[model samples]
Target chain A: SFQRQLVQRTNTLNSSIDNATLTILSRFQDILDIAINEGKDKYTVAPEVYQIECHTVSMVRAVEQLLDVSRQIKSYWLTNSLSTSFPTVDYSEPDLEKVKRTLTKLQNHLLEVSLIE
Target chain B: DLTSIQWRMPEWVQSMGGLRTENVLEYFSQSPFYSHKSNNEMLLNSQLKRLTGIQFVIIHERPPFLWVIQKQNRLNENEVKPLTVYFVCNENIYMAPNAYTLLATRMLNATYCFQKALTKIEKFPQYNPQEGYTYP
Candidate 1:
């Protein structure tokens, strides 16, 4: 019963993380596009732009929860390493390139973790 | 503009009878749209934080058969903005169409009906003062 529940729970967590990661990536790219076309300062003053940061932080929280579950399940070292591999970025002075890199890395790790039995 | 999130009720949610308010709330809490106060920290500096949460209230119900629930976006401690309504009928749950959606559908139907009538008139009516109007 534990195994069954764990499998189901992991599946749900993995899918939620995947969706959140994809959304964050898209939102980040949208902001980056605005920065490239119009200026980086434009986004800060733009209306509804704060949602991007909100989503990113929310996603980070989701990933942290998944990491906690992974640890509890005693998953492989590689899976556990995602916790440390997650990049920490300063929201006030965000580096778009670094944020993109972080989201991409998160996406790959999510895919890898999903394949685990 | 409203952004839609992908959400699927867990398979275990379906029971033999009508689902209670607690069961529905539990299902919603698991959705990506649902956020707790702790998660609001990221948006603390922005006004968006106050607008980000999913909540529901039972609007109507019938014993073991039907329940109408209104899903809302919690704006603050004293306010909530209704997003959509849902119907928990028997063993199934359905999203109730909003007024805007229903209005659009009816407008489209009326437009189509008028167009069809005009096309039929175009295909078969001959203008004549003597015969008035005639169709074969």
Candidate 2:
């Protein structure tokens, strides 16, 4: 339904926003992991340099996507979608578990950063 | 005492139905939507606008361990000053029971993390310091 998705645009964006929040935190963890494992100075991370490009590029792409999706949510409020009762994340399926796991991974990943001596 | 873990859920939810892992499961079942966990586009849209609820968890057992699981504001690029960033930080965290005493154990972890992240951000030299997103 993402195609006839006008009605749900805002809410869908919102969920993506939630995804973005965690995604940033995920980036935080990945950066921390590399720094610690390689004995990089604490507080020192090179967002630009990485031996493996996939995760790094993916993290950058995610951050950008979240920001873009968030902005899209705002546009909905302006033009007349005001009267519309934008949608919400339905728990009937497994999205709660899905989003929760992803976000928790963020928390857990961030927590791991502390372990780097 | 910084960036400690925080927990929050509606008092009424627990009262309306006792708080237990099973109850939590049951609760999410009723309106799992609040957490914004579904694919229903229209329902999802309205929920995203003023999405009313969220709870917090401590990242590493510190004073400010809170995060916004649900939110109202759209993440924008404008540099929001500390005061303007109120609810943005309002993804609040209530102290986990006895967190004050328990947090000490996680202190080393927190410091190590913040310090490490600081370094990473700095090393990027040309990296975007902006957490903001430009609309396409």
Candidate 3:
């Protein structure tokens, strides 16, 4: 039961972190798009000009969430969740379907920049 | 190779098992969240602390390239230096490998090669100029 709960919590954290990461990267990509595609002088302009409002706050939150989840995994889960006679089993099973979807999106929308040419 | 690609992934994300394609992508996409020591927030925040010139610009490439240009510590703003653009390219991304042994075999093979390349390129020397770096 404890192991299951730990796994559930991990999955929850992973899912949230995944979404947040993608969202932050998505916004950053937008900023990149404007600077590269619409800017003057070989795409050399302050990113703040094209910056999304409150983007730093969002990115900070994403990092904070990861730190929080990591702390819980370390302090709460790792220290107290294991049993003396714990069976040799791996409790963490990543959600595979979600991984596949992310992979597809990355392949499709992975951004690139060309200062060459 | 003045203009080249630089792949960045945190060192902690190592050894993925079971449904490898799916696992690796999640690992890569969530990299920024897990990486604080090396993130845009720190880069931009320092520039914010000192409101100076256009600290940096983010550049996008349509065919598998993403880059950033920074000018905070350069010798001068106008000095155009040679640029070694660091691009993150996951070229020819495809769906997760199916259960077929042949394709899955190739997938694993390619994944190993990819991982090695990422590691190698990551360790290579980066281009740094005392003055502002540019290409043209």
Candidate 4:
């Protein structure tokens, strides 16, 4: 019964993390498209210039969700999570590469959790 | 001098039971994971002195079918840097993929999914200036 509960919780966390990563990736692609069309450097493009609101808050929340899930796993297993090197995002000058890198790290964390059976 | 596409190991070595450190070392010596000849010589000569060179250490073991060996570069008597981890399961040896490799693979997968999503967005025929994307 305990095993099943743990598995169910892990599955839920996995799906949530995957959906969050996909949402972030899709948003990044949209931003890149806007930058490209505007004849600006995609890597350094500022989304605010085109009135495309930044989603850094949502992105940070997604990371917080990951940490919350990791805490749950720690409580269950009594072992430290595989990665605690979660990347931080800067809202001020939200560089495109930096955001993508942060998302990639988050996706990597999701992959690590999903691999545990 | 010449090597074939598939290198064959002796049947005795292949059928060995349990995880013997000697046998594991022998297997690695024949495999691509073997350290260079100079490094091997350095390891042998420095056995009585401060260790320096590549060495394999059994980090984990489970009787019958599971073991994990770490390939480490011994820089000095106190500092050893880990290079790769090898998993021995069911008599087969496999190099464990590190976090970076796994991350690269997941990044590729995410990129593919993002591209598909972008394509879907591009196909949307209608849009509203004030509201947002509109479906016909």
Candidate 5:
């Protein structure tokens, strides 16, 4: 029971910070706060760029929320915020889990180009 | 102008069902051309930040006059819709504006008249959606 919980928290921490999009977004609460705070500005470009309107504020907000989640993960890795424990038999160890794919995937994703033009 | 762009959104959008706060997906992200480049991390992140603030994006390819024409329209007060630009490359038809707002521009005026606000960004050859992407 203890082992699973420990690994779970560490893995969660690793994932949360792996998407470090900003400077350094480690810590679960910090990521949550950023999402909740920035939540206000989400909107349809048409209205802000033009006149009045009504749309799915929640749906728009939904996407923005996910973006922040990814951002928080990115921030975490960039800052090295995860606990230092590693490779031990205990689940609390940092390297106990194979999280390389997530980071590597981020690296792969970091490479590419696109334009709406 | 000489530059390279590499902006990529995370796949969290796919895994998280578009409701999570990871922001890897949205209406704009589903475009066929939505893309990113490798080895250019800084430029990529900058693109996202810029798109959050700017209203229009245009690309100028040729020295005197080379460019692509892709326009985004506001259907009404509540909706901003983008039209893909059609082109021919290698004798095959293709569409531009892969949804990353490569040259994502908004017509602030309802009369089909618009101004390019990316004047200052002209210095950089490779522009991003976040800061106003350039055209050719």
Candidate 6:
């Protein structure tokens, strides 16, 4: 019964975390995909533009990996037998500040495009 | 026009009139936008603090603009509301009034409109036997 209790509590924690992650991701969904991703699709607009796009995509991938790891952890806790110390695991969150830094550079390019027009 | 915004909010300005402090969700639901951006965090936060005592966080950025959302997690760090009102940052979006008095008046008008909309739902009159409620 104690293990069952632990299981339920972990589930609750996962639900809370999942909701938060999804909510944050949902807000940036279109902006990241269309604005940043598609904008980078042009690729050869400038000499350095392509390089920045790669970094941007990598950051986006980091966000995706964060979500994926969360899912894997959730399933592990749910289906597999777990101990109080079950996950001898650690997770590092995305470097959001760096992500923002990259996006700002891209935004500068867009601003120039806007100004030229 | 060549200078970037400093993000400094002036002091002594009164808060938005008729703002439903108790029900942010209801009040902001009428607004189509929910995310906002500012060049400076402190500037934006201070403006909001003096304006309505609300809090926000920078969730994303793009050069001169930083995307933000109202901090729904302040009361309960785990709570996240699905609907959030947001706006963009540019020279034109958060327009300034010619006078401080104009800012107050415009805010009051906007607050009244929000209040009026909510009042319609809460204070509807003339309930029928079966057909339901009607506007008074």
Error of 2 at B59 (Å): 58
lDDT of 6 by residue, A14-89 (tens): 7766765664566456335444444532222232333344444444444554555566666766897655665543
Predicted model with the maximum TM-score: 4
Local distance difference test values of all predictions, in order? 0.56, 0.44, 0.45, 0.60, 0.37, 0.43
Between candidates 2 and 3, name the one with more favorable TM-score: 3
Share of reference contacts found in each model:
0.00, 0.00, 0.00, 0.00, 0.00, 0.00
TM-score of chain A of 1: 0.35
DockQ of 4: 0.01
Higher-TM-score candidate of 1 and 6: 1
RMSD values for the candidates in order, in angstroms, are 41.4, 41.6, 41.0, 34.6, 38.0, 40.1
User: What lDDT score goes with residue B109 in model 5?
Assistant: 37
lDDT of 2 by residue, B70-109 (tens): 2223333332111111111222333223444445446546
Deviation (Å) of B82 in candidate 4: 1.8
lDDT of 6 by residue, B1-136 (tens): 3122223212211243322223222333323332243222334433443433234444434433323334332323343342232422431122122354455556656655654554465445554423344566
TM-score of the B chain in each candidate versus the native B chain: 0.57, 0.19, 0.22, 0.65, 0.18, 0.23
Which candidate, 2 or 6, has the higher lDDT? 2
lDDT agreement of model 1 with the native? 0.56
Error of 1 at A41 (Å): 35
Per-residue lDDT for A74-111 in model 5, tens only?
66568765677566566566662468867766777967
- Model 3 vs truth, CA RMSD: 41.0
Candidate 1's C-alpha runs over 4 A off are A1-117, B1-18, B27-52, B127-136
lDDT of 5 at B11: 58
lDDT (Cα, 0-100) at B81 in candidate 5: 53
Question: In DockQ, how does model 6 score against the reference complex?
Answer: 0.00
Give me the displacement of residue B73 in model 3, in angstroms: 56
